[PDB]
Amino acid sequence: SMEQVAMELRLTELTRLLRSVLDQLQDKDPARIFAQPVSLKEVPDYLDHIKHPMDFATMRKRLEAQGYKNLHEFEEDFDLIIDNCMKYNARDTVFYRAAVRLRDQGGVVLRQARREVDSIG
Ligand code: NA
DSSP states (O other), rough: OOOHHHHHHHHHHHHHHHHHHHHHHHHHHTTTSSSSSSOOOTTTTGTTSSSOOOOHHHHHHHHHTTOOOOHHHHHHHHHHHHHHHHHHTTTTHHHHHHHHHHHHHHHHHHHHHHHHHHHHO
């Protein structure tokens, strides 16, 4: 039905939009600390602390499957990247502090993206 196509076409240009939002977000992680999942070989205990594990590659894989139905589902996985690292690392570490930064630089990017999702529709 034409309604399916109108939804498919809406999903598409949400995912085009989010690709730009993901590329921008990731460019605030130039050290690339969040760009690949934390390894359960290198960190065998991660899962007795961290319940929903996440990184930018995983966000990328899901995205190209057009797996984010709204901006809020995208925001939800980003906050996991951030929130998992803060939880598992002490405040004085490079890791935790990168997580605080990525959140702050990131909020600018997610500000405009809300304005571009509602202006486009
Ligand atoms: Na902690």
